[PDB]
Design a protein around this ligand. Structure first.
Ligand SMILES: Cc1c(Nc2nccc3cc(CN4CC[C@@H](O)C4)cnc23)cccc1-c1cccc(-c2nc3cc(CN4CC[C@@H](C(=O)O)C4)cc(C=N)c3o2)c1C
Lengths: 115, 116
């Protein structure tokens, strides 16, 4: 029963710091890109779209552009890991990571930013 | 650029009656069911889990499953269609359909129930 898990579901972060949020999923083998979809959204803003190996800059929402990246190296370890640099106020909310790799599952993560 | 689209996003249905809600998705030529995942949820309750041609009635939530079905016939036309018979009160709320077929997309649909 393909599960995604969140190590931490609540992130308290400093304004202008850097953050990495993590979704873990089972990779019992060597990651097969033919099977892999990784999506990250925050309140209906598209953040990352990784589709079978394909990463499309064009669909990424204005805010996250040149601040958000998916750590590819980490994928191979079954860790969809979103790095957001220079955390702003508008960055606080519920994040969703959606994964499809054989089965499919998704999880939610809260971010709080201090002023 | 895989899109899921909804004909109607709001359904107002009468208590006890029957409803079909639909999610449409592109099906170039002949559906490959081995590559297809169709998921329906309502406020975190599992309604339908159709993974590669098997439906999973292990944990799928007993109030629905009792009245909820995926019309497989319609899949061939790129129509994920959830049929609920004898609409109850607990059936109102925001459903989500999540589809994976090459790409992946989801949509939300609101249901309201009347009782006259
Ligand atoms: C998550 C998931 C499921 N979930 C489940 N399936 C079966 C059983 C499932 C059972 C559970 C329950 N438990 C929880 C714990 C464990 O016990 C399992 C949960 N979940 C399931 C099914 C099918 C697809 C997905 C999924 C996977 C990966 C990615 C995306 C995705 N959405 C996008 C949305 C967009 C949005 N844009 C915006 C406009 C829109 C448009 O085109 O209309 C496109 C992009 C892009 C671009 N890439 C998008 O990718 C999606 C939906």
């Amino acid at each position: 029963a393909f599960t995604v898990t969140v190590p931490k579901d609540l992130y308290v972060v400093e304004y202008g710091s850097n953050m990495t949020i993590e979704c873990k999923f089972p990779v019992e083998k060597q990651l097969d890109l033919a099977a892999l979809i990784v999506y990250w959204e925050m309140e209906d803003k598209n953040i990352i779209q990784f589709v079978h190996g394909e990463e499309d800059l064009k669909v990424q929402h204005s805010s996250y552009r040149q601040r958000a990246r998916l750590l590819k190296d980490q994928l191979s370890l079954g860790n969809a890991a979103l790095q957001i640099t220079d955390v702003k106020l508008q960055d606080a909310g519920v994040y969703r990571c959606m994964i499809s790799y054989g089965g499919a599952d998704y999880k939610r993560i809260t971010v709080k930013v201090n002023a």
